[PDB]
């Protein structure tokens, strides 16, 4: 301490760290061109203007949703599977999995790009939910995401074929508990020997607090624009902050690991398949 | 097998059963005069007529609530603490606790009568929530139940003093996970050496499924009008069904246990304190 990025890379290369837990947020997906709905200059922002939302978070609040589900469904249509592709940061995580290093990847993102990059569902915790499935808000019948796709793409609010209630994608709204898969953290975090935090400001609970659940000996590597949350006001001696652009931090780590050419080959072959 | 009610009583009197888990539903509270909101002949039913609910369960459904919280708040006003008192069945459970037999009492009821009868919160799992606390539906600020009492009693929808959102009592609505305290069942049920099920038709999940979580050797005593749910289609050899009026079944068990005079003294002294 302080450890450097190169030290963390050597810990991995020497097989001193064998079980990596990863936490990711919106910063890993901006490079795929996913618009920040809350910032001017995207089709999504402009499409949301007509609704004059009181504030951006209302898009994931139940009282607002029931009053008018159209803004949320504007976002759903943009983020529904097939529109965006994973980028280098996702394929780095996929390569990490393929090399036997991934214990679990916890994501706050709802773009589904981790599964699209080919990481097994069993290795993933989609902590803020998924568009792969949906639930009637009235009768609780579950539906595959594909079942409401036609309505979503046509700007029709999806209705339940049994009771006519609004059918909502399984995205976690504020105030709702995270999906039960989130409870894997109880066993996963004490088992981790390295924590990687990529592209997140750690502003949402209870996801953010996971950073404290690894053992005091376990290095915590942050690759992010700045120092954030519990990492910023709860510094440990084995914390490494690689502050900067997320993709550049990943590219640096990948080169230190010795994986550059392999990563490039993987990315070329994968994107073609999409 | 089949065991009788008298056999279960002897198991308790001989201290062969020392750790009782209890599950209760609406049948234990009808004797306190709590109206079934979904049946003609009560002030509550009549007060709910003006809203012409499509069906009774809508009172605990979020889409309906947000569309019109007034029916739910009509129910809240009726059930808010201080209106109803516990009856003999609650005081039987209180006496069970006082005699060192209660591992945990799981209730589907939201009338709060278990805590009013003097059973410690630590022994209780209020699985369908409580009017003792409330949460802003928009900003998630918690409030003591007492903070919204004035509005509830005056038929005003309680609004949040910080963001003006509707403040909703912590009652579990359909589709919502049960409170995290419900997870005590994971440890409690395997630890139980007797399961008592009182006054419930076991029609709501995931509460109903708890009946299967005790060990195959553990007797399951049902005191209820009829045979219900997993007990009815998943009979075990140590199941006892005391079918009949709930209070009469309790009074019979109490007499077999040898607790009648003590129970009567307890009830007299407790109700006075209210």
């Amino acid at each position: 301490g302080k450890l450097s990025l190169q030290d963390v890379a050597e810990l991995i290369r020497a097989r001193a760290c064998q079980r990596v837990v990863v936490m990711v947020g919106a910063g890993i997906s901006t490079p795929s061109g996913i618009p920040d709905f809350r910032s001017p200059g995207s089709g999504l922002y402009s499409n949301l203007q007509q609704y004059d939302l009181p504030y951006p978070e209302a898009i994931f609040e139940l009282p607002f949703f029931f009053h008018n589900p159209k803004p949320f469904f504007t976002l759903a249509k943009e983020l529904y599977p097939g529109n965006y592709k994973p980028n280098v940061t996702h394929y780095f995580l996929r390569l990490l999995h393929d090399k036997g290093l991934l214990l679990r990847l916890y994501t706050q993102n709802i773009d589904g790009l981790e599964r699209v990059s080919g990481i097994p569902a069993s290795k993933l915790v989609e902590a803020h939910g998924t568009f792969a499935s949906a639930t009637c808000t009235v009768c609780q019948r579950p539906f595959p995401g594909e079942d409401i796709r036609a309505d979503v793409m046509a700007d029709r609010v999806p209705r339940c074929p049994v009771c006519t209630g609004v059918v909502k994608p399984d995205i976690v709204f504020f105030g709702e508990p995270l999906p039960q898969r989130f409870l894997l953290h109880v066993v996963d975090f004490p088992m981790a020997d390295l924590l990687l935090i990529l592209g997140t400001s750690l502003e949402v609970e209870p996801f953010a607090s996971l950073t404290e659940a690894v053992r005091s000996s376990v290095p915590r590597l942050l690759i992010n624009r700045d120092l954030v949350g519990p990492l910023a006001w709860h510094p440990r001696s084995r914390d490494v902050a690689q502050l900067g652009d997320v993709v550049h931090g990943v590219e640096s780590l990948v080169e230190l690991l010795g994986w550059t050419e392999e990563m490039r080959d993987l990315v070329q072959r994968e994107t073609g398949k999409l | 097998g089949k065991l009788s009610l008298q056999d279960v009583a002897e198991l308790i009197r001989a201290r062969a059963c020392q750790r009782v888990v209890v599950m209760v539903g609406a049948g234990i509270s009808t004797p306190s005069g709590i109206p079934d909101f979904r049946s003609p002949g009560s002030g509550l039913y009549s007060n709910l007529q003006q809203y012409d609910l499509p069906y009774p369960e809508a009172i605990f459904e979020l889409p309906f609530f947000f569309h019109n919280p007034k029916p739910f708040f009509t129910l809240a006003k009726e059930l808010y603490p201080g209106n109803y008192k516990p009856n003999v069945t609650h005081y039987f459970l209180r006496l069970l606790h006082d005699k060192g037999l209660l591992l945990r009492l799981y209730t589907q009821n939201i009338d709060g009568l278990e805590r009013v009868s003097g059973i410690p919160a630590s022994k209780l799992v209020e699985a369908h929530g409580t009017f003792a606390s409330a949460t802003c539906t928009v900003c998630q600020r918690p409030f003591p139940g007492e903070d919204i009492r004035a509005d509830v009693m005056a038929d005003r929808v309680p609004r949040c003093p910080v963001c003006t959102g509707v403040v909703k009592p912590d009652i579990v609505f359909f589709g919502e996970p049960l409170p995290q305290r419900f997870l005590l069942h994971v440890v409690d049920f395997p630890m139980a050496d007797l399961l008592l099920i009182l006054g419930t038709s076991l029609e709501v999940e995931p509460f109903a499924s708890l009946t299967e979580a005790v060990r195959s050797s553990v007797p399951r005593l049902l005191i209820n009008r009829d045979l219900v749910g997993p007990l009815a289609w998943h009979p075990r050899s140590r199941d006892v069904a005391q079918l009949g009026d709930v209070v009469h079944g309790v009074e019979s068990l109490v007499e077999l246990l040898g607790w009648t005079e003590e129970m009567r003294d307890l009830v007299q002294r407790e109700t006075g304190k209210l």
């Binding site: 504020f174 105030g175 508990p177 502003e203 949402v204 609970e205 209870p206 | 998630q140």
Partner: peptide, 7 residues
């Protein structure tokens, strides 16, 4: 609390 909330 169980709920998703901004910190």
């Amino acid at each position: 609390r169980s709920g998703k909330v901004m910190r």
